[PDB]
Design an enzyme around this catalytic site. Sequence first.
Site, PDB file in Angstrom:
ATOM      1  N   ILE A  11     -85.418  21.325  84.531  1.00 15.90           N
ATOM      2  CA  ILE A  11     -86.332  21.103  83.649  1.00 15.90           C
ATOM      3  C   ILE A  11     -86.768  21.098  82.296  1.00 15.90           C
ATOM      4  O   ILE A  11     -86.013  22.275  82.151  1.00 15.90           O
ATOM      5  CB  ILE A  11     -87.424  22.155  84.211  1.00 15.90           C
ATOM      6  CG1 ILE A  11     -87.346  22.595  86.191  1.00 15.90           C
ATOM      7  CG2 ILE A  11     -89.481  21.529  84.124  1.00 15.90           C
ATOM      8  CD1 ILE A  11     -88.270  22.753  86.727  1.00 15.90           C
ATOM      9  N   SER A  16     -84.177  13.449  79.963  1.00 12.45           N
ATOM     10  CA  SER A  16     -84.662  12.148  79.568  1.00 12.45           C
ATOM     11  C   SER A  16     -84.247  11.091  77.911  1.00 12.45           C
ATOM     12  O   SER A  16     -84.173  10.569  77.603  1.00 12.45           O
ATOM     13  CB  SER A  16     -85.854  12.246  79.356  1.00 12.45           C
ATOM     14  OG  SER A  16     -87.126  11.110  79.000  1.00 12.45           O
ATOM     15  N   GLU A  34     -85.993   9.028  87.208  1.00 11.87           N
ATOM     16  CA  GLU A  34     -86.305   9.613  88.286  1.00 11.87           C
ATOM     17  C   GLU A  34     -87.958   9.215  88.618  1.00 11.87           C
ATOM     18  O   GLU A  34     -88.864   9.061  88.474  1.00 11.87           O
ATOM     19  CB  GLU A  34     -86.196  11.046  88.988  1.00 11.87           C
ATOM     20  CG  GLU A  34     -86.256  11.944  87.866  1.00 11.87           C
ATOM     21  CD  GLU A  34     -86.095  13.013  88.459  1.00 11.87           C
ATOM     22  OE1 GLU A  34     -85.520  13.828  89.067  1.00 11.87           O
ATOM     23  OE2 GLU A  34     -86.101  14.550  87.512  1.00 11.87           O
ATOM     24  N   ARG A 100     -80.839  12.096  87.649  1.00 12.93           N
ATOM     25  CA  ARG A 100     -80.684  13.596  88.620  1.00 12.93           C
ATOM     26  C   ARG A 100     -80.768  12.195  89.844  1.00 12.93           C
ATOM     27  O   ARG A 100     -80.267  10.614  89.693  1.00 12.93           O
ATOM     28  CB  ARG A 100     -82.401  13.722  89.475  1.00 12.93           C
ATOM     29  CG  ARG A 100     -82.828  15.023  88.153  1.00 12.93           C
ATOM     30  CD  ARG A 100     -83.855  15.954  89.141  1.00 12.93           C
ATOM     31  NE  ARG A 100     -83.667  17.074  87.894  1.00 12.93           N
ATOM     32  CZ  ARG A 100     -84.364  17.890  87.539  1.00 12.93           C
ATOM     33  NH1 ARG A 100     -85.656  16.826  87.540  1.00 12.93           N
ATOM     34  NH2 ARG A 100     -84.910  19.540  86.336  1.00 12.93           N
ATOM     35  N   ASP A 105     -82.313  16.168  94.925  1.00 13.96           N
ATOM     36  CA  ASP A 105     -83.480  15.601  96.053  1.00 13.96           C
ATOM     37  C   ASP A 105     -83.146  17.082  96.826  1.00 13.96           C
ATOM     38  O   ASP A 105     -84.065  17.767  97.205  1.00 13.96           O
ATOM     39  CB  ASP A 105     -83.601  14.978  96.367  1.00 13.96           C
ATOM     40  CG  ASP A 105     -83.826  13.769  95.109  1.00 13.96           C
ATOM     41  OD1 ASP A 105     -85.288  14.099  94.491  1.00 13.96           O
ATOM     42  OD2 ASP A 105     -83.496  12.565  95.455  1.00 13.96           O
ATOM     43  N   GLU A 212     -78.548  23.798  71.793  1.00 11.63           N
ATOM     44  CA  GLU A 212     -78.858  23.667  70.086  1.00 11.63           C
ATOM     45  C   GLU A 212     -79.615  22.051  70.376  1.00 11.63           C
ATOM     46  O   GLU A 212     -78.847  21.367  70.852  1.00 11.63           O
ATOM     47  CB  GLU A 212     -77.313  22.750  69.652  1.00 11.63           C
ATOM     48  CG  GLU A 212     -77.694  23.365  67.873  1.00 11.63           C
ATOM     49  CD  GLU A 212     -76.338  22.896  67.149  1.00 11.63           C
ATOM     50  OE1 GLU A 212     -75.628  23.545  67.560  1.00 11.63           O
ATOM     51  OE2 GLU A 212     -76.331  23.283  65.738  1.00 11.63           O
TER      52      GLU A 212
HETATM   53  C1  LIG Z   1     -96.967  27.435  93.749  1.00  7.55           C
HETATM   54  O1  LIG Z   1     -96.020  27.073  93.849  1.00  7.55           O
HETATM   55  C2  LIG Z   1     -95.575  25.761  93.057  1.00  7.55           C
HETATM   56  C3  LIG Z   1     -96.225  24.953  92.518  1.00  7.55           C
HETATM   57  C4  LIG Z   1     -95.349  23.636  91.978  1.00  7.55           C
HETATM   58  C5  LIG Z   1     -94.314  23.143  92.669  1.00  7.55           C
HETATM   59  C6  LIG Z   1     -94.224  22.471  92.116  1.00  7.55           C
HETATM   60  N1  LIG Z   1     -92.415  21.436  91.884  1.00  7.55           N
HETATM   61  C7  LIG Z   1     -92.533  20.585  92.012  1.00  7.55           C
HETATM   62  C8  LIG Z   1     -91.130  19.737  91.251  1.00  7.55           C
HETATM   63  S1  LIG Z   1     -90.910  19.069  92.855  1.00  7.55           S
HETATM   64  C9  LIG Z   1     -89.585  18.180  92.653  1.00  7.55           C
HETATM   65  N2  LIG Z   1     -88.990  17.533  93.608  1.00  7.55           N
HETATM   66  C10 LIG Z   1     -87.557  16.584  93.636  1.00  7.55           C
HETATM   67  N3  LIG Z   1     -86.583  15.868  94.332  1.00  7.55           N
HETATM   68  C11 LIG Z   1     -87.531  15.877  92.197  1.00  7.55           C
HETATM   69  C12 LIG Z   1     -88.068  16.415  91.052  1.00  7.55           C
HETATM   70  N4  LIG Z   1     -88.615  16.418  89.898  1.00  7.55           N
HETATM   71  N5  LIG Z   1     -89.302  17.179  91.913  1.00  7.55           N
HETATM   72  C13 LIG Z   1     -93.511  19.872  91.366  1.00  7.55           C
HETATM   73  S2  LIG Z   1     -94.558  20.532  91.677  1.00  7.55           S
HETATM   74  C14 LIG Z   1     -93.641  24.232  93.555  1.00  7.55           C
HETATM   75  C15 LIG Z   1     -93.910  25.498  93.752  1.00  7.55           C
HETATM   76  O2  LIG Z   1     -93.101  26.943  94.072  1.00  7.55           O
HETATM   77  C16 LIG Z   1     -91.480  26.738  93.943  1.00  7.55           C
HETATM   78  C17 LIG Z   1     -91.093  27.726  94.663  1.00  7.55           C
HETATM   79  F1  LIG Z   1     -90.450  28.142  93.704  1.00  7.55           F
HETATM   80  C1  LIG Z   2     -92.913  29.756  91.578  1.00  8.80           C
HETATM   81  O1  LIG Z   2     -93.884  29.115  90.618  1.00  8.80           O
HETATM   82  C2  LIG Z   2     -93.478  27.935  89.694  1.00  8.80           C
HETATM   83  C3  LIG Z   2     -93.090  26.637  90.719  1.00  8.80           C
HETATM   84  C4  LIG Z   2     -92.885  25.876  89.487  1.00  8.80           C
HETATM   85  C5  LIG Z   2     -93.479  25.453  89.354  1.00  8.80           C
HETATM   86  C6  LIG Z   2     -93.896  24.162  88.757  1.00  8.80           C
HETATM   87  N1  LIG Z   2     -94.601  23.052  88.207  1.00  8.80           N
HETATM   88  C7  LIG Z   2     -94.169  22.096  87.410  1.00  8.80           C
HETATM   89  C8  LIG Z   2     -95.463  21.599  87.005  1.00  8.80           C
HETATM   90  S1  LIG Z   2     -96.006  20.032  88.305  1.00  8.80           S
HETATM   91  C9  LIG Z   2     -96.639  18.392  87.172  1.00  8.80           C
HETATM   92  N2  LIG Z   2     -97.652  18.333  87.829  1.00  8.80           N
HETATM   93  C10 LIG Z   2     -98.688  16.640  86.688  1.00  8.80           C
HETATM   94  N3  LIG Z   2     -99.137  16.202  86.854  1.00  8.80           N
HETATM   95  C11 LIG Z   2     -97.410  17.218  85.893  1.00  8.80           C
HETATM   96  C12 LIG Z   2     -95.845  17.571  85.141  1.00  8.80           C
HETATM   97  N4  LIG Z   2     -96.119  17.244  84.707  1.00  8.80           N
HETATM   98  N5  LIG Z   2     -96.320  18.272  86.282  1.00  8.80           N
HETATM   99  C13 LIG Z   2     -93.139  21.766  87.893  1.00  8.80           C
HETATM  100  S2  LIG Z   2     -92.256  23.231  89.274  1.00  8.80           S
HETATM  101  C14 LIG Z   2     -95.159  25.718  88.644  1.00  8.80           C
HETATM  102  C15 LIG Z   2     -95.251  27.397  89.192  1.00  8.80           C
HETATM  103  O2  LIG Z   2     -95.682  28.352  88.850  1.00  8.80           O
HETATM  104  C16 LIG Z   2     -96.832  27.416  88.348  1.00  8.80           C
HETATM  105  C17 LIG Z   2     -98.002  28.157  89.862  1.00  8.80           C
HETATM  106  F1  LIG Z   2     -99.855  27.992  89.131  1.00  8.80           F
HETATM  107  O1  LIG Z   3     -82.093  17.891  71.946  1.00  7.31           O
HETATM  108  C1  LIG Z   3     -83.284  18.164  72.497  1.00  7.31           C
HETATM  109  C2  LIG Z   3     -83.751  17.642  73.323  1.00  7.31           C
HETATM  110  C3  LIG Z   3     -85.413  17.876  74.373  1.00  7.31           C
HETATM  111  N1  LIG Z   3     -85.418  18.025  73.232  1.00  7.31           N
HETATM  112  C4  LIG Z   3     -87.170  18.597  73.595  1.00  7.31           C
HETATM  113  O2  LIG Z   3     -87.627  18.900  75.183  1.00  7.31           O
HETATM  114  C5  LIG Z   3     -88.642  18.693  75.940  1.00  7.31           C
HETATM  115  C6  LIG Z   3     -87.966  18.111  76.671  1.00  7.31           C
HETATM  116  O3  LIG Z   3     -87.158  16.777  76.896  1.00  7.31           O
HETATM  117  P1  LIG Z   3     -86.867  16.574  79.064  1.00  7.31           P
HETATM  118  O4  LIG Z   3     -88.330  15.803  78.558  1.00  7.31           O
HETATM  119  O5  LIG Z   3     -86.067  14.727  78.417  1.00  7.31           O
HETATM  120  O6  LIG Z   3     -86.232  16.831  79.278  1.00  7.31           O
HETATM  121  P2  LIG Z   3     -85.352  16.701  81.099  1.00  7.31           P
HETATM  122  O7  LIG Z   3     -86.882  17.125  81.473  1.00  7.31           O
HETATM  123  O8  LIG Z   3     -85.903  15.141  80.862  1.00  7.31           O
HETATM  124  O9  LIG Z   3     -84.617  17.208  81.659  1.00  7.31           O
HETATM  125  C7  LIG Z   3     -89.331  17.461  75.038  1.00  7.31           C
HETATM  126  O10 LIG Z   3     -90.429  17.133  74.426  1.00  7.31           O
HETATM  127  C8  LIG Z   3     -87.903  16.760  73.824  1.00  7.31           C
HETATM  128  O11 LIG Z   3     -88.463  15.950  73.162  1.00  7.31           O
HETATM  129  C9  LIG Z   3     -85.839  18.743  71.218  1.00  7.31           C
HETATM  130  O12 LIG Z   3     -86.960  19.192  71.075  1.00  7.31           O
HETATM  131  N2  LIG Z   3     -84.014  18.224  71.139  1.00  7.31           N
END
Ligand SMILES: COc1ccc(-c2nc(CSc3nc(N)cc(N)n3)cs2)cc1OCCF
Ligand SMILES: COc1ccc(-c2nc(CSc3nc(N)cc(N)n3)cs2)cc1OCCF
Ligand SMILES: O=c1ccn([C@@H]2O[C@H](COP(=O)(O)OP(=O)(O)O)[C@@H](O)[C@H]2O)c(=O)[nH]1
Lengths: 232, 233
Positions: A11, A16, A34, A100, A105, A212
Amino acid sequence: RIKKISIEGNIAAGKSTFVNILKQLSEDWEVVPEPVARWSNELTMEQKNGGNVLQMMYEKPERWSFTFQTYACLSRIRAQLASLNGKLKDAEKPVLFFERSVYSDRYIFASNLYESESMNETEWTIYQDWHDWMNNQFGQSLELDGIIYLQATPETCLHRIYLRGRNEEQGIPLEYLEKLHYKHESWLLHRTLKTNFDYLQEVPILTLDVNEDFKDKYESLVEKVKEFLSTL
Amino acid sequence: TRIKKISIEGNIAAGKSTFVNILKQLSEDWEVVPEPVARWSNELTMEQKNGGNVLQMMYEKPERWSFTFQTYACLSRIRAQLASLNGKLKDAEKPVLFFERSVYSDRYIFASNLYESESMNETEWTIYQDWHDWMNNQFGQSLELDGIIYLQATPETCLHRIYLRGRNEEQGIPLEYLEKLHYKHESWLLHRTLKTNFDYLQEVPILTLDVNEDFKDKYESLVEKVKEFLSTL
Ligand SMILES: COc1ccc(-c2nc(CSc3nc(N)cc(N)n3)cs2)cc1OCCF
Ligand SMILES: COc1ccc(-c2nc(CSc3nc(N)cc(N)n3)cs2)cc1OCCF
Ligand SMILES: O=c1ccn([C@@H]2O[C@H](COP(=O)(O)OP(=O)(O)O)[C@@H](O)[C@H]2O)c(=O)[nH]1
Ligand SMILES: COc1ccc(-c2nc(CSc3nc(N)cc(N)n3)cs2)cc1OCCF
Ligand SMILES: COc1ccc(-c2nc(CSc3nc(N)cc(N)n3)cs2)cc1OCCF
Ligand SMILES: O=c1ccn([C@@H]2O[C@H](COP(=O)(O)OP(=O)(O)O)[C@@H](O)[C@H]2O)c(=O)[nH]1
């Protein structure tokens, strides 16, 4: 004869940013972003459905993980078929870069939800079966010619999430990044991870260091990709 | 082209298992496909272990497990039906494959019911339908039916018959759940009032058989109708 290349990494690694650089460099070069990126945002019914489950997953990952993971993977497969049977038509040296893969996945995201208990045994085994099958019925033509690993430290990624300033990502912990970082390192660098996809086990991999900032200084990276492409 | 595929539809305990076991004895050119779910009832296989587990939870808590159950059941049905095409009726003169139920009861009888009982929420139901649409889109004419045989029984008959079969997890099955499933069976297969999302289903021939009468040691008239139905497809 379109070359299929997966762009992989943690992440906020800069996937991107990187892919949007590459599609602009050649008329032969095209990008499929994705589904999860698309959802996190007059808008289609996949967005509708994607919007809801991403939100649902944040409240209650142990309720929604299977549904989400199942839907994310179908949504990816459809999109990858859409560009592969359409777009890039009919280039002299066509290359499709996938943001990805069905492997990320499964072996990054779906595996990590199972390991942190948001999927029970049954959900995880139904998922792997469904995965194996969905891909073998419909996803044959999605075998990758190569993989580009954008390698960043778990620390650069958390800083990059901050730099990207999206409200809902701000509470992502460093240990979650470390789990996904370690899982990437053992699949793509050490190659300890055995998949059910035997052909993968010897797909060429290009590992790039994006710690970097590359946004203004990417030419050495692009050089490595062009060299890697010729070698396939 | 060139195996005929006919699905057997009817309410629970209407008599589809009993009638396919009868049909399949009567011609080596006729085979049957037991429905995976009915199997999941009973070292076991991967699917069977998942199936039984997902079934019990489904029973224990349908509003948690309806979306998961329905996708696994339907994926597994497609699996069993595609294998049958392959392993079966290779060289015989007039092959007929008789499916116990179909991909269309998965959705328009069961999943649909489950949505209607709020066992699946809107996003779940919409996700199910998305997946079901696309996935059957990919096969085209291959799993597509040549004919439906509807075994129509009132819920009382079915209710009594659940009593006769005498399965534990089945005496709970309330009369009013059976009546709703009947409704949907009548509408799809008898009054033909169900809108659906697969073009050819409007055309597909359907034989309805009244099965309220016990037919175990007395089934020739029903079979005669089936033989007459087939020679039109
Ligand atoms: C509060 O705990 C969570 C809260 C949010 C998440 C989320 N993970 C995600 C990413 S799942 C994912 N699957 C994919 N196949 C691809 C992709 N880009 N993202 C969105 S929200 C995952 C969480 O638990 C992860 C436990 F390590
Ligand atoms: C184990 O703890 C976590 C594991 C994964 C997450 C994740 N959160 C996310 C953000 S979900 C999301 N929703 C959106 N609407 C937009 C966006 N950019 N991202 C990705 S992975 C967040 C986690 O902690 C947040 C618990 F509140
Ligand atoms: O060389 C870099 C690569 C990424 N970014 C910034 O870091 C964040 C994450 O980049 P991106 O969203 O493309 O990462 P992804 O989640 O797609 O792998 C964004 O604000 C980018 O503009 C940056 O400042 N320098
Ligand atoms: C609204 O109430 C119900 C509606 C439907 C049912 C159903 N039960 C079943 C059978 S449960 C079962 N579990 C198994 N493990 C095996 C097997 N043969 N059957 C099918 S539909 C059960 C219902 O209530 C359960 C107890 F009241
Ligand atoms: C407690 O409430 C219930 C308990 C169990 C059920 C069950 N239905 C089933 C079978 S649904 C089915 N779906 C399929 N896709 C195929 C098939 N042959 N059967 C097993 S358990 C259904 C229930 O419904 C509650 C209200 F709809
Ligand atoms: O002509 C018949 C057909 C069936 N049955 C009984 O009714 C129950 C339900 O039948 P079946 O298993 O065929 O129903 P399905 O669920 O397969 O429709 C079973 O115990 C059968 O022995 C019966 O008494 N007479």
